Antibody, heavy 230, light 213 residues
Framework: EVQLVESGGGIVQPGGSLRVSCAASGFSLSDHYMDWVRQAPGRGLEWVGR??????????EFAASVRRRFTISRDDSNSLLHLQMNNLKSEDTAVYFC????????????????????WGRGTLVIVSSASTKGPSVFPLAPSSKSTSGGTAALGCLVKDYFPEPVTVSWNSGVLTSGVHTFPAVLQSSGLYSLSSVVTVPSSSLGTQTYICNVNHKPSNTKVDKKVEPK | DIQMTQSPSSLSASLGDSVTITCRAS??????LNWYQQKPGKAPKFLIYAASRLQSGVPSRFSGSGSGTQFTLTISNLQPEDFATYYC?????????FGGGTKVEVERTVAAPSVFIFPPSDEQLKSGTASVVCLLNNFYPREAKVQWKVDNALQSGNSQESVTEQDSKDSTYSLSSTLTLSKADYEKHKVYACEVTHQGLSSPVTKSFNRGE
């Protein structure tokens, strides 16, 4: 079974270093090219770098955006591939995939006739200066401006927490229909914020109790916020 | 150097349809174009190399074509596992680059969003911040324009939005947009509105409130 699996990612402060690693199995690591690709959360793939096989003396190359900062090391005796990232920036935050490169029609040599046939799990690297912080839970209260002809919307705003994630339920899990918990956004301050909404019959406001349960385990914060009409 | 542009960025179809994804290079590159498939939360999967050659194990309903600056990936008899994002990647010359990706999503009938506004709560106002929230509920297609207006002044850059994944049940989207001001900045204005434009609305829908009420 050909397998690539990465590790070593973490939360790193800006300016620091971090070494991610890729363990291979099922194939001779020294005989293939090995690339590093990265993907910022909610965006596309970005080719980071390449380390050549033994026939090409393990020479490395990198994209211009990490060229003066990233380095590749190969320990083929232990089937390990290390990506050393120094002087990390905020934009370096991404999932880093280790990738095996295979050549087709190799009778023609080592040209552009290559693909990436095996991708690893990827390891998340986040470059931030924020420290662990529990969130504040504010009510998005239903009102006339939150009604659409029998339907009302209410919810909770879980603001200023680090790091991810928080979990949100409604009425201890009793309420599921009409619930939309949105993926968090990263604010300019380096803290996360998300919204959790539910649409209910407007005739149920004032007579039915709605509670949002928020749990941010990294800070062991747990809150039950009642949302009342405005 | 070489930049890949994929079109369209979002594609919708049903089971059994045949979809086509276009990848255009800014300069000619023979046929050194590979196609990968990625689903949310998982690593990319190698699909096609050399523009038209299938990797062993890939179902024959996938096909590729193209040379020079334009390439296409076609999926016939679309299956449930085919709904994902697809990326082209040129192997022609360093530095190697990927396309922006194209989402193959579940097509359904158009549905206009339900728009709601939430003023900042008094509890957040005691802290020193004010977050106004605008919610678009259960709409399709995803293309929608949300505009924040403060006293008829268009806000640009001081808000952030978030879009859920396509619903597994009714295949619609939902959007949340937060406009965060500081408390003295919030107290200096009166009217706060979000204006929503979408294919399902007869006209732009504006939801607004005054800081008083």
């Amino acid at each position: 079974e050909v397998q690539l699996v990465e590790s070593g990612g973490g939360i790193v402060q800006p300016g620091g270093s971090l070494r991610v690693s890729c363990a291979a199995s099922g194939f001779s690591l020294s005989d293939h090219y090995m690339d590093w690709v990265r993907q910022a959360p909610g965006r596309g793939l970005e080719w980071v770098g390449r380390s050549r096989n033994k026939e090409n003396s393990f020479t490395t190359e990198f994209a211009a955006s990490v060229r003066r900062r990233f380095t590749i090391s190969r320990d083929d005796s232990n089937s390990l591939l290390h990506l050393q990232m120094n002087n990390l920036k905020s934009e370096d935050t991404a999932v880093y995939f280790c990738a095996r490169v295979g050549y087709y029609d190799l009778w023609s040599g080592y040209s552009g006739n290559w693909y990436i046939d095996v991708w690893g799990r990827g390891t998340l690297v986040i470059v931030s200066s924020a420290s662990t912080k529990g969130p504040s839970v504010f009510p998005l209260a239903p009102s006339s401006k939150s009604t659409s002809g029998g339907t009302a919307a209410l919810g909770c705003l879980v603001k200023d927490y680090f790091p991810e994630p928080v979990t949100v339920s409604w009425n201890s899990g009793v309420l599921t229909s009409g619930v939309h918990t949105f993926p968090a956004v990263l604010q300019s301050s380096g803290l996360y914020s998300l919204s959790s909404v539910v649409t209910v019959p407007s005739s149920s406001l004032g007579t039915q109790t709605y509670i949002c349960n928020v749990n941010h385990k990294p800070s062991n914060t747990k809150v039950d916020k009642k949302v009342e009409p405005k | 150097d070489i930049q890949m542009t994929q079109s369209p960025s979002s594609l919708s179809a049903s089971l059994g349809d045949s979809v086509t994804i276009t990848c255009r290079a800014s300069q000619t590159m023979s046929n050194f174009l590979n196609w990968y498939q990625q689903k949310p939360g998982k690593a990319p999967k190698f699909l096609i190399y050399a523009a038209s050659r299938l990797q062993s194990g890939v179902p024959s309903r996938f096909s590729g074509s193209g040379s020079g600056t334009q390439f296409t990936l076609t999926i016939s008899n679309l299956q449930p596992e085919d709904f994902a994002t697809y990326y082209c990647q040129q192997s022609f010359l360093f530095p190697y680059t990927f396309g922006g990706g194209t989402k193959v999503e579940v097509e359904r009938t158009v549905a206009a969003p339900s728009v709601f506004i939430f003023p900042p709560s008094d509890e957040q106002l005691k802290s020193g911040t004010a977050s106004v929230v605008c919610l678009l509920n259960n709409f399709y297609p995803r293309e929608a324009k949300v505009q924040w207006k403060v006293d008829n002044a268009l806000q640009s850059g001081n808000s952030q939005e978030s879009v859920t994944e396509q619903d597994s049940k009714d295949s619609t989207y939902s959007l949340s947009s937060t406009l965060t001001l500081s408390k003295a900045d919030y107290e200096k204005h009166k009217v706060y509105a979000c204006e929503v434009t979408h294919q399902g609305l007869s006209s732009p829908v504006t939801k607004s409130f005054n800081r008083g009420e």
